[PDB]
Amino acid sequence: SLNFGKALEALKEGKKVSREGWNGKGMFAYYVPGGVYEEVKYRPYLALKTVDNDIATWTPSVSDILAEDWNIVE
Amino acid sequence: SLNFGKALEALKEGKKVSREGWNGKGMFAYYVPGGVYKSQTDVIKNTFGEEVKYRPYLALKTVDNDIATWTPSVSDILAEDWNIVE
Amino acid sequence: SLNFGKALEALKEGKKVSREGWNGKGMFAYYVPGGVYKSQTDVIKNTFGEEVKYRPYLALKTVDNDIATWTPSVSDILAEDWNIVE
Amino acid sequence: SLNFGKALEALKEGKKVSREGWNGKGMFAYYVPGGVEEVKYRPYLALKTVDNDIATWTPSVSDILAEDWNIVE
Secondary structure, three states: EEEEHHHHHHHOOOOEEEEEEHHHOOEEEEEEEOOOOOOOHHHHHHEEEEOOOOOOOOOOOOHHHHOEEEEEEE | OHHHOOOOOHOOOOOOOEEEHOOOOOOOEEEEOOEEEEEHHHHOOOOOOOOOOOOOOOEEEEOOOOOEEOOHHHHHHOOEEEEEEO | OOOOHHHHHHHHHEEEEOOOOOOOOOEEEEOOEEEEEEEOHHHHOOOOOEEEEEEEEEEEOOOOOOOEEEOHHHHHOOOOOOEOOO | OOOOOHHHHHHHHEEEEEEEOOOOOOEEEEEEOOOOOOOOOOOOEEEEOOOOOEEEEEHHHHHHOOOOOOEEE
């Protein structure tokens, strides 16, 4: 049971995190670093592997930020 | 300058936080505790019940001295330029 | 099944909206209007002023019968499975 | 002066949109279609920011409620 601050550090280190309140085992969020792609530089962002096994751009809600039921998933 | 994890700690303790670009704009965020409010109208009771419980949330004083119930953006969460503002 | 543009118009009209694709069932979002209120202490008046204007925002009745501040995700905005809930 | 519902339709039709309240010339958002052991990614939104960098953008509630959107040519 971690707060969002330590879950954010885990994200910035490349780890996967999830919430017990999400009610979705298999769901995890991860951090995508920024990069340069006549060259375009992309900002870092957060992503989520959903229950539909697809990738979606993720923005934490206020409940996610205030929650203290975070866990690091392998 | 602090990361968002330490800024969230100051928020939960009743302090005000702000990013570097917000000073001069009068902007800061603060934490509002949750509560329980009693329903008055039957239409409110028929949808929410006799009582309605609100979760804790965050507020943000904008540049116009008006208050917005705030959801931090990804750039705010990934930023490391937060400060405790007195 | 509506897109988010028509669900937003329903929100601004005071209606409640929900998505079929949401895993949590029984949830809906609704529109909270803005307001202006009187300050009750010197600490607020010396930081805000006499009147505090509050911006409108969106709330979500969760599966716990709780009220949380809500910001739609990108998937919510692009989805076309919205309906008005009575 | 369009609301977000018509700006979203312009996004889904491949157009660029921006706000007046953004108070930033050159900033615009656009729609990126979804696509593809193998990983499937959903369609999302991108924003050309103030420093010529591209971010994966989610509209704030103020952006969704604002009615100052335009189509950027």
